[PDB]
Design a protein around this ligand. Structure first.
Ligand SMILES: CCCc1nn(C)c2c(=O)[nH]c(-c3cc(S(=O)(=O)N4CCN(C)CC4)ccc3OCC)nc12
Ligand SMILES: [Mg+2]
Ligand SMILES: [Zn+2]
Length: 324
């Protein structure tokens, strides 16, 4: 622990190119926990966030390890690896996808922090499950229960001694940054994505999209977050297939809880008896949620196409299995 920290602060950080983190095709699967922390340091560095905000090396390392530790290893999918991947998709969206110079430094700082923080202390279970099972977290919060908890955890970490990576900021810049972080985290609630999609899609469709407008900037950021959150849907096939079983593992565990705690029939997505239905379900997922989103991000930035390409290729593959 104090040893993992001394390991990390002493290590050489390889370049962005050596670590492959500018590729939309990036895979974490064969990296050690230590190597993922190294990648993260690089991400903060090449977005000019260490330089622009006076982050001490030792402090960023301690924060990165604090985050990593507050994810739950026993949770099939919503653990550190997902948080890390989400951040890597953000980093590629900013660098390879060229979103970077459409945003301010404060926004980028917020997004990257948010990407790594957005699922902190997840329990492998829904908002619905949390609500209906009367879990304590649903007395503190009445909408986006999990997402509000994730932000609270994030805030709690940014403010614990030795971990204050935002300390270089003025009271004004700090308040601004937290506000963006909160909105970014809240935006990773699929319900709120569905709720605001249509406005974003009409803006694109009528060629009225414009980042100069404060309201549209906010919207775009929310969309970006969803794009990164769902990004495993865009990876090469060996990766996507592997990641899908993890997500399914996580759902099936929830279905168990729903059968015993709530006494209801879990929905196919969530029933292990219909393990057979996974392909068809993934196709449905892609069609209803993902493709339209990556189609739009590609209108915002030509260079984000590889995300939509990846998504369409995974659709073909799942559809092939859906007919056996
Ligand atoms: C909170 C988890 C979001 C998510 N991440 N990832 C990687 C996936 C995924 O691969 N599949 C699904 C998924 C979504 C639907 S859904 O789009 O049909 N579902 C319908 C109802 N809405 C409200 C939510 C999504 C159905 C099946 C799924 O996976 C089974 C392996 N969700 C996620
Ligand atoms: Mg989430
Ligand atoms: Zn997530």
């Amino acid at each position: 622990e104090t040893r993992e920290l001394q390991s990390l602060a002493a290590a050489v950080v390889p370049s962005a190119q050596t670590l492959k983190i500018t590729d939309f095709s990036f895979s974490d699967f064969e990296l050690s926990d230590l190597e993922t922390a190294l990648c993260t340091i690089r991400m903060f560095t090449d977005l000019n966030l260490v330089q622009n905000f006076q982050m001490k090396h030792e402090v960023l390392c301690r924060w990165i390890l604090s985050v990593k530790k507050n994810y739950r290893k026993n949770v099939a999918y919503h653990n550190w690896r997902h948080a890390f991947n989400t951040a890597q998709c953000m980093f590629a969206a900013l660098k390879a996808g060229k979103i970077q110079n459409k945003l301010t430094d404060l926004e980028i700082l917020a997004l990257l922090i948010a990407a790594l923080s957005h699922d902190l202390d997840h329990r492998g279970v829904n908002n619905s499950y949390i609500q209906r099972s009367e879990h304590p977290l649903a007395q503190l919060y009445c909408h986006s229960i999990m997402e509000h908890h994730h932000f609270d955890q994030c805030l709690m970490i940014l403010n614990s001694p030795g971990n204050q990576i935002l300390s270089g900021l003025s009271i004004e810049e700090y308040k601004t940054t937290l506000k963006i972080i909160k909105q970014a985290i809240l935006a990773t609630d699929l319900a709120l994505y569905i709720k605001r999609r249509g406005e974003f899609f009409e803006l694109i469709r009528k060629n009225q999209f414009n980042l100069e407008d404060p309201h549209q900037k906010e919207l775009f950021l929310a969309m970006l977050m969803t794009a990164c959150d769902l990004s495993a849907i865009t990876k090469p096939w060996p990766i996507q297939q592997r990641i899908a079983e993890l997500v399914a593992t996580e759902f099936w565990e929830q279905g168990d809880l729903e059968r015993t705690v709530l006494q209801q029939q879990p929905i196919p997505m969530m029933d292990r008896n219909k393990r057979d239905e996974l392909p068809k379900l993934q196709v449905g997922f892609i069609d209803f949620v993902c493709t339209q989103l990556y189609e739009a991000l590609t209108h915002v930035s030509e260079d984000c196409f590889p995300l939509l390409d990846g998504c369409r290729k995974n659709r073909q593959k799942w559809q092939a299995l859906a007919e056996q």
